[PDB]
Amino acid sequence: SYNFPAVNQLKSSKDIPDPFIFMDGSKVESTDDWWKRQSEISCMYEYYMYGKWIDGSDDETTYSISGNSMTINVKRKSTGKTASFKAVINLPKNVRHEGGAPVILGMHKGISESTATSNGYAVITYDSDGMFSAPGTAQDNNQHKGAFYDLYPYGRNWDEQTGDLMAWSWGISRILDALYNGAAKELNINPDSSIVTGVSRYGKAASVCGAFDTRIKMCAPSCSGAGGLALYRYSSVGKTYDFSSKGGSSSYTYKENEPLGSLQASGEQGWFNGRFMEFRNAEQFPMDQHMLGALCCDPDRYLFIIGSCESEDWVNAPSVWMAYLGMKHVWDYVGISDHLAINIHKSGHAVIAEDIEKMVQYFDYHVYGIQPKMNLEELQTSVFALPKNKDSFADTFASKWLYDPAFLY
């Protein structure tokens, strides 16, 4: 449903919104109520932030493979229009999972592909470097040009506006369609064992992709920052942390975090929808990004958050950590606490080798029953949980929520 108030009619609050309160003020009182609230949250994100999700109901996908180059061809059934875009295949030399290799679907090249393939996982990414060459589905700008927009033009009404993050997500869905439609058998991939990942602006994209294409088994957004998984309402500027347990500095003080106006600037607004430009303060959002993450909460799915302690203060890892703490309430309420994971590594604005290694051990355990070598409890905490690094905010932000049981964190 999209019968939502205009932005200028929204109440403002500094509190982190309760995921368990519906827009109309009614309460989640059962897990069945949660599934309904999750659907509402999904619609709210379309309406206020990312644009209309295009779910593939109108798309017919075919493909071709030449060496490691994959061409994805899409026809929009109602209009007859066609578009195409390119992806890159990386297969493991040895498949070790019955039913085919798991597949990491990447928003761009350069996500530690060789670590994945050495561990038996396939990787298919857009033929994009994550910077100068954007995915073929949409150029990285505010003019909305590319294979997605050739089929779904960016128009004047809100339902006609789908931002670049959703355009990039749509192409991942079409790659997955091609896999189910024959490509997975050709490549010795299990298309049900799917992961989506990407970094920075493409980490925002990966979060959106997992939230909206619920077929993808694990969502793994890296260093996604503002408009990704960071809380809009939590600032870490001027806070000091001890990162020595991770090999970092024993007294590291964060500089600036990205603020709302930076997301609304010409170089970033294309990622969002037109309605997003109406917001003036973070306190106006009828959500915060723990709720975007919670769109991936499901008994058959997993969310694996990646971020960094040092050298990327703008993407606000402490606020991503706070959002993760909020998400823990939802995953615990549904009874699947271990389906939520987080790796705050020392540094690297990237998906680095240890991220892949830990993703593989985690996914192998939950999806295949393979016992891990590592202690998976390490993915259920971070350096921000050390008492000396704790903000009192962590213990109070959820205190008004309907579900705030003791000892979640």
Author numbering: 366 to 774
Task: Copy the relevant paper text.
Glucuronoyl esterases (GEs) within the carbohydrate esterase family 15 (CE15) esterase family, in a range of aerobic and anaerobic fungi and bacteria, have been identified as playing an important role in breaking down LCCs by cleaving the ester bond between 4-O-methyl-d-glucuronyl in xylan and alcohol groups in lignin. GEs share an invariant Ser-His-Glu/Asp catalytic triad and employ a conserved catalytic mechanism that involves the formation of an acyl-enzyme covalent intermediate, which is subsequently cleaved through acid-base hydrolysis. Rumen GEs adopt a canonical α/β hydrolase fold: FsCE15, PrCE15, and RfCE15 adopted the canonical α/β-hydrolase fold that is seen in all of the GE structures solved to date. The fold of all three enzymes consists of a central twisted 10 stranded mixed β-sheet flanked by α-helices on either side.
RfCE15 is the C-terminal GE domain of a multi-modular enzyme from R. flavefaciens called CesA. The structure of RfCE15 was refined to Rwork/Rfree of 16.8%/19.0% using data with a maximum resolution of 1.25 Å. The catalytic residues of RfCE15 are observed in a non-canonical configuration, with the putative general acid Glu677 located on a loop at the end of β8; making RfCE15 a member of the CE15-A GE subfamily. The general base (His714) is located on a loop directly above the catalytic serine, but is shifted by 2.2 Å relative to the position of this loop in FsCE15 and PrCE15. The shift in this position accommodates the non-canonical conformation of the general acid residue. Despite the shift in Cα of His714, the imidazole ring occupies a similar location as that found in the other GEs, with His714 Nε2 making a 2.8 Å hydrogen bond with Oγ of Ser565, and a 2.9 Å bidentate hydrogen bond with the carboxyl functional group of Glu677. Most notably, a 16 amino acid insertion from residues Gly603-Tyr619 forms an extended Ω-loop that wraps around the backside of the general base loop. As observed in other CE15-A subfamily GEs, the conserved disulfide bond found in CE15-B GEs, was not observed in RfCE15. Instead, these residues are Val564 and Val715 and form a hydrophobic pocket that is composed of an extended network of Van der Waals interactions between Ile114, Ile121, Met228, Phe314, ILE316, Ile366, and Met369. In contrast, the addition of reducing agent to RfCE15 did not alter its thermal stability, an observation consistent with the lack of disulfide bonds.
